[PDB]
Motif scaffolding. Structure first.
Motif, PDB file in Angstrom:
ATOM      1  N   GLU A  41     114.185  94.731 173.645  1.00 54.22           N
ATOM      2  CA  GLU A  41     114.330  93.767 172.562  1.00 54.22           C
ATOM      3  C   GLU A  41     114.026  94.376 171.200  1.00 54.22           C
ATOM      4  N   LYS A  42     113.326  95.506 171.155  1.00 53.70           N
ATOM      5  CA  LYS A  42     112.985  96.141 169.889  1.00 53.70           C
ATOM      6  C   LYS A  42     114.153  96.884 169.263  1.00 53.70           C
ATOM      7  N   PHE A  43     115.234  97.108 170.006  1.00 54.41           N
ATOM      8  CA  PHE A  43     116.363  97.906 169.531  1.00 54.41           C
ATOM      9  C   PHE A  43     117.461  96.950 169.109  1.00 54.41           C
ATOM     10  N   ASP A  44     117.442  96.569 167.840  1.00 50.21           N
ATOM     11  CA  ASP A  44     118.392  95.557 167.406  1.00 50.21           C
ATOM     12  C   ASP A  44     119.830  95.992 167.631  1.00 50.21           C
ATOM     13  N   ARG A  45     120.108  97.291 167.608  1.00 50.15           N
ATOM     14  CA  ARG A  45     121.494  97.729 167.694  1.00 50.15           C
ATOM     15  C   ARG A  45     122.078  97.626 169.095  1.00 50.15           C
ATOM     16  N   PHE A  46     121.243  97.618 170.133  1.00 49.47           N
ATOM     17  CA  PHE A  46     121.784  97.541 171.484  1.00 49.47           C
ATOM     18  C   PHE A  46     120.937  96.674 172.415  1.00 49.47           C
ATOM     19  N   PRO A  88     105.231 110.210 159.435  1.00 50.76           N
ATOM     20  CA  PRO A  88     106.416 109.361 159.279  1.00 50.76           C
ATOM     21  C   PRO A  88     106.684 108.528 160.507  1.00 50.76           C
ATOM     22  N   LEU A  89     106.375 109.068 161.678  1.00 52.20           N
ATOM     23  CA  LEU A  89     106.641 108.380 162.930  1.00 52.20           C
ATOM     24  C   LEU A  89     105.742 107.160 163.068  1.00 52.20           C
ATOM     25  N   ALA A  90     104.448 107.332 162.800  1.00 49.71           N
ATOM     26  CA  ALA A  90     103.550 106.190 162.835  1.00 49.71           C
ATOM     27  C   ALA A  90     103.955 105.153 161.804  1.00 49.71           C
ATOM     28  N   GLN A  91     104.314 105.587 160.600  1.00 49.34           N
ATOM     29  CA  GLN A  91     104.627 104.593 159.581  1.00 49.34           C
ATOM     30  C   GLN A  91     105.833 103.751 159.990  1.00 49.34           C
ATOM     31  N   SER A  92     106.898 104.384 160.468  1.00 44.74           N
ATOM     32  CA  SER A  92     108.073 103.600 160.827  1.00 44.74           C
ATOM     33  C   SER A  92     107.816 102.751 162.064  1.00 44.74           C
ATOM     34  N   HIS A  93     107.123 103.301 163.063  1.00 45.86           N
ATOM     35  CA  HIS A  93     106.960 102.572 164.317  1.00 45.86           C
ATOM     36  C   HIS A  93     105.949 101.447 164.184  1.00 45.86           C
ATOM     37  N   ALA A  94     104.932 101.616 163.340  1.00 43.81           N
ATOM     38  CA  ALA A  94     103.995 100.525 163.093  1.00 43.81           C
ATOM     39  C   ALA A  94     104.608  99.444 162.221  1.00 43.81           C
ATOM     40  N   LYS A  96     107.988  99.191 160.477  1.00 44.30           N
ATOM     41  CA  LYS A  96     109.365  98.729 160.568  1.00 44.30           C
ATOM     42  C   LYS A  96     109.721  98.284 161.983  1.00 44.30           C
ATOM     43  N   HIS A  97     109.566  99.171 162.959  1.00 44.38           N
ATOM     44  CA  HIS A  97     110.031  98.845 164.300  1.00 44.38           C
ATOM     45  C   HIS A  97     109.057  97.956 165.057  1.00 44.38           C
ATOM     46  N   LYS A  98     107.769  98.021 164.726  1.00 47.23           N
ATOM     47  CA  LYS A  98     106.721  97.200 165.334  1.00 47.23           C
ATOM     48  C   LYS A  98     106.576  97.489 166.829  1.00 47.23           C
ATOM     49  N   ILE A  99     106.218  98.734 167.135  1.00 47.44           N
ATOM     50  CA  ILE A  99     106.132  99.218 168.510  1.00 47.44           C
ATOM     51  C   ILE A  99     104.658  99.278 168.906  1.00 47.44           C
ATOM     52  N   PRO A 100     104.181  98.393 169.774  1.00 43.77           N
ATOM     53  CA  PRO A 100     102.776  98.466 170.185  1.00 43.77           C
ATOM     54  C   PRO A 100     102.469  99.767 170.908  1.00 43.77           C
TER      55      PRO A 100
HETATM   56  C1  HEM Z   1     107.388 109.452 172.039  1.00 44.76           C
HETATM   57  C2  HEM Z   1     107.542 108.302 171.391  1.00 44.76           C
HETATM   58  C3  HEM Z   1     108.621 108.065 170.341  1.00 44.76           C
HETATM   59  C4  HEM Z   1     109.177 108.921 169.477  1.00 44.76           C
HETATM   60  C5  HEM Z   1     108.848 110.397 169.250  1.00 44.76           C
HETATM   61  C6  HEM Z   1     110.144 108.180 168.710  1.00 44.76           C
HETATM   62  C7  HEM Z   1     110.924 108.715 167.716  1.00 44.76           C
HETATM   63  C8  HEM Z   1     111.797 108.017 166.916  1.00 44.76           C
HETATM   64  C9  HEM Z   1     112.520 108.562 165.787  1.00 44.76           C
HETATM   65  C10 HEM Z   1     112.425 110.020 165.313  1.00 44.76           C
HETATM   66  C11 HEM Z   1     113.246 107.565 165.268  1.00 44.76           C
HETATM   67  C12 HEM Z   1     114.138 107.638 164.025  1.00 44.76           C
HETATM   68  C13 HEM Z   1     113.280 107.748 162.752  1.00 44.76           C
HETATM   69  C14 HEM Z   1     112.260 106.637 162.625  1.00 44.76           C
HETATM   70  O1  HEM Z   1     112.657 105.468 162.377  1.00 44.76           O
HETATM   71  O2  HEM Z   1     111.041 106.913 162.756  1.00 44.76           O
HETATM   72  C15 HEM Z   1     113.001 106.377 166.052  1.00 44.76           C
HETATM   73  C16 HEM Z   1     113.584 105.145 165.861  1.00 44.76           C
HETATM   74  C17 HEM Z   1     113.315 104.013 166.587  1.00 44.76           C
HETATM   75  N1  HEM Z   1     112.351 103.898 167.555  1.00 44.76           N
HETATM   76 FE1  HEM Z   1     111.220 105.368 168.295  1.00 44.76          FE
HETATM   77  N2  HEM Z   1     110.167 106.879 169.134  1.00 44.76           N
HETATM   78  C18 HEM Z   1     109.248 106.773 170.149  1.00 44.76           C
HETATM   79  C19 HEM Z   1     108.985 105.626 170.857  1.00 44.76           C
HETATM   80  C20 HEM Z   1     109.590 104.403 170.693  1.00 44.76           C
HETATM   81  C21 HEM Z   1     109.441 103.249 171.546  1.00 44.76           C
HETATM   82  C22 HEM Z   1     108.600 103.220 172.821  1.00 44.76           C
HETATM   83  C23 HEM Z   1     110.189 102.271 171.041  1.00 44.76           C
HETATM   84  C24 HEM Z   1     110.429 100.842 171.549  1.00 44.76           C
HETATM   85  C25 HEM Z   1     109.941 100.344 172.691  1.00 44.76           C
HETATM   86  C26 HEM Z   1     110.808 102.774 169.838  1.00 44.76           C
HETATM   87  C27 HEM Z   1     111.624 102.055 169.005  1.00 44.76           C
HETATM   88  C28 HEM Z   1     112.378 102.587 167.992  1.00 44.76           C
HETATM   89  C29 HEM Z   1     113.409 101.876 167.274  1.00 44.76           C
HETATM   90  C30 HEM Z   1     113.755 100.395 167.509  1.00 44.76           C
HETATM   91  C31 HEM Z   1     113.967 102.739 166.423  1.00 44.76           C
HETATM   92  C32 HEM Z   1     115.177 102.491 165.513  1.00 44.76           C
HETATM   93  C33 HEM Z   1     116.360 102.757 166.488  1.00 44.76           C
HETATM   94  C34 HEM Z   1     117.768 102.556 165.968  1.00 44.76           C
HETATM   95  O3  HEM Z   1     118.098 103.037 164.850  1.00 44.76           O
HETATM   96  O4  HEM Z   1     118.590 101.927 166.703  1.00 44.76           O
HETATM   97  N3  HEM Z   1     110.431 104.083 169.655  1.00 44.76           N
HETATM   98  N4  HEM Z   1     112.100 106.680 167.042  1.00 44.76           N
END
Ligand code: HEM
Length: 152
Positions: A41-46, A88-94, A96-100
């Protein structure tokens, strides 16, 4: 803190992932979505994909897997000296994406499961323990950065 020997076990299985990061990323994210459907559900695109067949055919999912595994690989290759990469990874995931953190745990579990199945030659018990250590360290440090950023 991991020993150099532990890091080498991590990197030697990652070398096999890198034969085909796209295919490994598909297996890993599909496993995640099947074991923990709420994560999709966190991946709006798919998030609309309904079946494993649709997931395997999704170029968008494939690209997400490549991007994530490559970023993780860069972190692992720093052997714990990953401060710059986590910012950058923590900032976006905390924010924007809101990934616990629990979802990062779920993904770590999927990584371990796929490596265990695909790579018995480089993912025996000691190697799996080293990978668990490395992923636990990643999650510990990123959780600390989440807290700094205002996301508990
Ligand atoms: C080892 C752990 C992870 C790594 C290294 C990783 C890395 C990345 C990177 C590099 C991006 C693109 C740049 C950014 O927005 O930061 C991204 C996007 C994203 N990540 Fe992660 N991620 C991880 C885990 C997760 C998990 C567990 C989820 C969700 C359950 C998640 C959800 C997303 C979403 C929703 C996006 C945007 C995707 C899109 O454009 O369709 N990430 N992630």
């Amino acid at each position: 803190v991991l020993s150099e020997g532990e890091w080498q076990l991590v990197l030697h299985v990652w070398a096999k992932v890198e034969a085909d990061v796209a295919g490994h990323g598909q297996d890993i994210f599909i496993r995640l979505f099947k074991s923990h459907p709420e994560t999709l559900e966190k991946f709006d695109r798919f998030k609309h994909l309904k079946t494993e067949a649709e997931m395997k055919a999704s170029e968008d999912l494939k690209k997400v897997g490549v991007t994530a595994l490559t970023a993780l690989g860069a972190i692992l290759k720093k052997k714990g000296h990953h401060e710059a990469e986590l910012k950058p990874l923590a900032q976006s995931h905390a924010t924007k994406h809101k990934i616990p953190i629990k979802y990062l745990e779920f993904l770590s579990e999927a990584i371990i499961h796929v490596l265990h199945s695909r790579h018995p030659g480089d993912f025996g018990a000691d190697a799996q323990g080293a990978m668990n250590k490395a992923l636990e360290l990643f999650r510990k440090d990123i959780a600390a950065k989440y807290k700094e950023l205002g996301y508990q």
